[PDB]
């Protein structure tokens, strides 16, 4: 409040301005060595206790009068405590710098004791900066079923420090944002043309009808509705040939499945594929 | 105590103020080079031994008189020891800075010997800052069964440096707070619409009745009471088809289960599902 | 706007230039100690509130007039908020430096409170610099199916901070660029002469016809069309001899396969190889 | 010793004070440029060799006279060697700073050569600070069977740098304290209401009597003495249904077991549970 | 261009040199406080806009005239953008330092905002320095089939930041050079006297003929051509004795195999070894 | 040698002291700007080439005269090379600081080029400081069979940088000391009351005699000589009940076994336990 | 060359010394503000282009005249390029410091742009310092078959940055030296009294003859020649008792085996042990 707090803050620096310092030129060691360390030494000592009144009138204005603020009560009552040590740290650290008493000895205990809280606020401040860069980069939105670190889930909320995303067990995970600027984000809702990589083991003991099984499965997959063909072709090749079988890794490429249309297709592709395998008189394998 | 400690602290700087320095202008090298290094050199040397009396009268006022303080006795008796080296470090480090003796040689052994304890207090101070950010971000409360790093447990206490949460074995884990600003917090009590991902292997050898099993299991799951349907549909599709079977991954989505209502449902969904499988004359699979 | 914002910015420094400071030589402590801390103290205090008008007229010029800018609306409305704390930080940090009030006490809270955001912007700024080095080094292009960390996918987009590459499940992964300057990038589209490393177990119980199987498989592989021979020779040697079998690790080297020509060859090489094995009357092994 | 060491330390600075410097005002370059670099250059050079006598009279006073000190002999004989390089480093680093010879060139080899031992003492000093924070935070006491990193053991000793805790093999592990401020501490002796999570596979082939087995096991567990019921209910639900069986995950919640009362209960709960399973005519499963 | 760009760069500092500053000694605050902050303040302000013309005439000289330079077009068009912010950063950061306006407030936003890009360019600059040390240390050449981190491949190219090496699947891996100064490089082409470590399980049930099998296999291996014997002897000892067998770990040491001469030997050593095992009437084991 | 090296070192600074500088007051720019940059500029330039003679007379005094020193020859011949670049670095870095030529430009290439070797000597200097803290903390002695990181072995030697401990294969491991201040040290020779955690599977199919087996095994273990009972009781409970068996985890607590008395007890406890199991007519299990 | 390069380097500073600066006292702003910024500004500007001639006459003296130097040609031709940017960096960084133009703005772009290459040369310079500490600590020699990180091999070469050691596959691994000051070095050639830890499963079904098997195996092992007994006794105890067997972990301690004497003993100890087992009529186990 710039209309009601400057009275003991600024009127008591107009006081020490006029009463003792400016009007009075008393020659008993008060000009050469006290005119500068008691104006700047007293502007600061009554600008720190300006900011203490501008700060602790967020006690009167925000929590006492308004209904606990735009924060909560326990959030703002420890904010009028962690901003009262960062105001005493700048208060003693600037009031000792202007009074000339121990200038570069309190600045080195408060520039090193204040870089201790910069070595240590690399996690919470890294989350603030990475969550500040998620607003520019935009990897996801409020519905995208992303995954950072096997943290598959749809994004509930996007905060500054932590985005909360609702897990595969429908548990609201609260991912810190520094896991988004240092890790892979597999965004799974801005995804068109999804894919199948299934595998069917099959007991042949023939090893020569199997290019016709591998041809007719491809002829199933490219003559399938809701299958995308502009990207990679539907592949069905064999691998892992053993004493009795050869497992065919069926691959296909769907188009914009909605997760209940998806599993009907991942079911019916594999079932129709097994129908084509049983058409050639060969049963399925033991793995 | 600003009413009873300034006597040998501040009366002996009013002493060296008036007796030797201010009133006396003795010309034998006492003004050009001793007026400033013995006022600021003696304000500081009797402000450090002010803070030593304000500090060691927390011995008389807190532990000797009051019942061992708001800390314990062994907490505050090593606090009147770790604050007596941070007062001798600022005492020699400011008393050597005002006396001009070795200014930037003690400041570089105490600004580097004091950043050794800032390289090293990145764990305990990181826990203080991350536990100070848990008050603003609020990932959990005193009942939330969260997990940070396979550290599943309900939160007993929320401290500055370590929140203690009671484990799955009902052992009170004491998680440091820097595991909350750098890691995922799967908060499991602000969770509505929980889910089932079960799997049922089933020996068919038919592979063509199985869309009717996969349809009738879905018709069980969406006609089930206490099952949420506004989010993802109850899915029952097959995967991993082999020589004799196909395992059906039954998925469902419950609503706000209370962990004893939960397992009755995760039991009866799977039992009723097996009843529907045995209705179609197919038994369960070998995995 | 250098034609319409300097009026209250620069005309009110020509004001305090001429009106009070330059023309007026009033001897009541206004020259020795106020001529420099109120010109540079007021150039800066009306150059910060120049840049506040040049900055908040990107509100009028970019989002209000033009259609939300070359950024979006929510991108530029938090850019006129994160550039208004970096202008108040340089505003108080330079306005306190020119006014001489607490010079090296606000510079040490803003050079340490501004290196807190340099300890912490090592992820987002590391992504900017590594994505700035991807433009010079060029590991990949817009079609290259690269992989950084089991992150196999063709590159959709190449941004500053994150390149997005479409995964093996055709999910648009959004890889941060610092995973490209610190990790291996297996670029799989600037690849000629691809290879096969297959394995065929085979029940012999002879262990002496097997150099003729290993010779005739090599004679298959080097007399194969679309097989590259200028690099490593097509090898077929045995390993892992056991109670009944010896698995032959067939290796070959193809030439510039197009991923649907590829698996036809990886099929027919192994099938023709099994035809050569069954020509020598030995069946395949149990692994 | 402030009564017997100042003789060659301080009497030879009263010597160079009176004999050559203070009383003598010889005009051959001895006042303008030698009065300050040979008082502060000789106070320091006879305050370093004060601290060398106060330091090496811990040789006479502590190890030679007293029985090897409160440390050992090999501890204090290398402490009068690592404090004689930190006194020669501050001795040359302050004696070169007061003599003006190479001020900011020895301070930059001793403020950088002394931050080499601050980059490197982040492990031992991190253990000192984290073990100094274990006195305030108090995660455990001298009997608590804690575990930090699969380091299960009861705490023998709690030092500054390393707490030693006696392992599960009854080997005295010596955990560094920085593993307590950066890692989870599962304190297992301030634990009330311990739990059972057992599993019983059981060959049913019925799948319809099993809600009565799951009801009667719960009726065993809540009608059990020394079982806590104010927290989570005793659950017995099925999971992992397969070709012949369904494994029932029996859970229960005991009360303050003393590790030999515990395993009698974890035995008799599972035995009585198997008695209830064999009461319903179904045998146990194959897993 | 030092023959055609200094005209508006340097002729307009000879202008402000002669016209206003040097020849003119106008006494209206232009000598005591403007002679130094407007020569060095205007040398710099017309040396930055010298380097802007020397820089943006790499636009005219390199890309517009010559065919897109020794870089590409998109490489050099973002190089005339990332060198125009490092010239505006040094331009405002030196032009504000010479004009005296906010000296140590812009230097602390540009020495800390420029060490943000030194905390962050530790990956790309680490690759430049480690790839600059690969030229001195020389771990490999353009044909060496090295491996850093299971990154087996022959080295295609050796760049500054990334050496590209063609993988075991003949995919051109692009390894960053900091994986060569911090990790093991198994250089496999400057390798003489390669080795075999094979294993043969063998069903004996005798356990007493086996020193003669282990002697005759060694007599095979040292009487083998292309086998090196100056280093370690060819060993054949048993290990892992079980119910029926004992697996003999045959070791040998070849000489400078060329990868197709190699596998013929690794085949024929094991085949001849099995011939010696079948000579003693014992068949091979089950593992 | 302070009796024979100061002749060209210190006599040539008494030379430039008296001959040119002190006695001669020649007014041709030799007092205002050359009296200080050529005394301190020549004290240093003949104190660096004092330390070069005090350093390279460790060539004459230590290796040439004495038998290669208390180090070896190859140790001290590279110590008169790595101390001749740290003397040229302080020689040019202080000789350029006193001569005033480029003071803060060589100090910033030698305070940053000398903190490059402080970023990098965090491993070797961390080993020196952690091995300097092993002398105070004392985790082990010269016979203690400790383990740091699955590095089980008895400690042969305890150096400054690396303690060498003889492995479980009796290979002298050379552990760096920074693995002792950052990792767990399971000291296994200051261990009293060792333990057994054995397991016996046993085919019962009774599940009701097994509290008498679990009682009689405990009655064996507490009536056993050389078994400690003041700590945890000898436990024998069952776990992992399956189709036919229940494995009993026998635990016991021995007393100060000497590793050949140990395994006789770990043998005879399990054998006597199996005798008690076969007394109750039940054989051992399949696991 | 201090006899032929100082002509344009030093004769053109004797030129600007005598011709314009020293002899000429022209009063047109050439003494107060140009006498110091153009002597030190021109000593440096003709000492940098002294070192450019002393540097680029390693082009004439080393590679052009001598046969490509003690380095190679490609090593020294990029050394006359990476020392020509560290001479232009110190050239502009000191020439801008003496000319006074932008002193603390180029020093902060070259003390921060030169600590970017100190954040980044922590790998190559860490290898130089750790390989410089391998000369003092001496963990190994040129024949020692050491292992750092499963990097078993005999040491071929010991460089500054990387020691190359020939692998178990006889591939010359090139280990960086920072893997020796931060990791365990199991030096396996300064090893006396090697050991055996073998295991023999054995089908007993007796469980009472087995102390006589465990006694007679020990009587074999201590009555064995080339077996060391001054350290740990030869142990043979049982563990892992199951349905039919008990595996006896035979341990022994050999003496200074030479790797072909070794495996004959590790063979014959196990064979003789199996002979003693078959003497007691019990066959070997199934594991």
Curated annotation (Swiss-Prot), chains A, B, C, D, E, F, G:
Transmembrane portions of the chain: 12-32, 34-54, 76-96, 101-121
GO biological process, one term: cellular response to oxidative stress
Subcellular location: Mitochondrion membrane
One GO location term (cellular component): chloroplast
Main subcellular location: mitochondrion
Membrane topology of this protein: Multi-pass membrane protein
GO molecular function: mechanosensitive monoatomic ion channel activity
Keyword Transport among UniProt keywords: yes
Keywords of this entry: Ion channel, Ion transport, Membrane, Mitochondrion, Transit peptide, Transmembrane, Transmembrane helix, Transport
UniProt function note: Mechanosensitive channel that opens in response to stretch forces in the membrane lipid bilayer.
Sequence similarity: Belongs to the MscS (TC 1.A.23) family.
The protein, known as: Mechanosensitive ion channel protein 1, mitochondrial
Origin species: Arabidopsis thaliana
Higher taxonomy: Eukaryota, Viridiplantae, Streptophyta, Embryophyta, Tracheophyta
Gene name as annotated: MSL1
């Amino acid at each position: 409040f710039w209309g009601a707090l400057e009275d003991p803050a600024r009127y008591l620096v107009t006081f020490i301005a006029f009463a003792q310092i400016a009007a009075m030129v008393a020659p008993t060691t008060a000009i050469a060595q006290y005119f500068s360390p008691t104006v700047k030494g007293a502007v600061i000592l009554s600008l720190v206790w300006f900011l203490y009144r501008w700060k602790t009138n967020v006690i009167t204005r925000m929590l006492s009068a308004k209904s606990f603020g735009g924060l909560d009560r326990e959030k703002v009552l420890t904010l009028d405590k962690v901003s009262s040590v960062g105001l005493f740290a700048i208060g003693l650290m600037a009031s000792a710098e202007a009074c000339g008493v121990a200038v570069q000895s309190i600045l080195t205990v408060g520039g090193v004791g204040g870089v201790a809280t910069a070595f240590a606020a690399r996690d919470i401040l890294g989350n603030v900066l990475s969550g500040l860069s998620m607003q520019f980069s935009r990897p996801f939105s409020m519905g995208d079923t992303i995954k950072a670190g096997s943290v598959e889930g749809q994004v509930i909320e996007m905060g500054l420090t932590t985005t909360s995303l609702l897990n595969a067990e429908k548990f609201p995970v609260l991912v810190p944002n520094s896991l988004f600027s240092s890790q892979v984000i597999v965004n799974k809702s801005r995804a068109q043309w999804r894919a199948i990589a299934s595998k069917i083991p099959l007991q042949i003991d023939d090893l020569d009808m199997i290019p016709q099984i591998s041809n007719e499965i491809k002829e199933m997959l490219r003559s399938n509705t809701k299958v995308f063909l502009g990207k990679e072709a539907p592949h069905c090749y064999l691998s892992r040939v053993e004493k009795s079988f050869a497992e065919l890794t069926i691959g296909c490429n769907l188009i914009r499945m909605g997760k209940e249309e998806l599993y009907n297709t991942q079911q019916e592709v594999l079932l129709e594929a097994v129908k084509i395998i049983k058409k050639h008189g060969v049963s399925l394998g033991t793995t």
